[PDB]
Design a protein around this nucleic acid. Structure first.
Lengths: 89, 89
DNA sequence: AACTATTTATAAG
DNA sequence: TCTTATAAATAGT
């Protein structure tokens, strides 16, 4: 196992990335179908190249999002760090 | 114990798979975010159009960057991933 | 790439 | 909530 930290190697991160992201798209695709929901993923690498996923119409979702006015779940890496760290392994 | 990628017809099933499988997505994203040094943004509407969001850093900054993006880029759908797991066995 | 030793993700109870 | 048995994810080789 590795602990979650910046892959300092260059050929490593560009491989982990290229596959770990397909994972994210997979898990999303699956959740998308199972629970019947719209999803939209957006990934910029360190060199600002775009990679995107959407169960359906990407921009229709990103729009719906801007219009949303109620409060709603909003997580950051910090939120998730402190939800796994408050979870003694 | 494994499941088929198909609409959970039960109501309090999907509403549980969802609530946890999505924290997985956020997790997997959070990890990829840190490891390979990249900006990521998740947008999920459930079937009743309640919003859930994740962003490694600033959601707005990423959604902007996205609308500015002009080059071609990786652009997946459920179809693309169906036909990438169907052409695999 | 491909293989497998390991770890993680999660379905049922 | 909380295991736990089964399964998927991916780091090492």
């Amino acid at each position: 196992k590795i602990q979650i930290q910046r892959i300092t190697d260059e050929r490593n991160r560009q491989v982990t990335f290229t596959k770990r992201k397909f994972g994210l798209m997979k898990k999303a695709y699956e959740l998308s179908v199972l629970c019947d929901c719209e999803i939209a993923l957006i990934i910029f690498n360190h060199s600002n190249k775009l990679f995107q996923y959407a169960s359906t119409d990407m921009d229709k979702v990103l729009l719906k999002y801007t219009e949303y006015n109620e409060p709603h779940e909003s997580r950051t890496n910090a939120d998730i760090i402190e939800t796994l760290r408050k979870k003694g392994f």
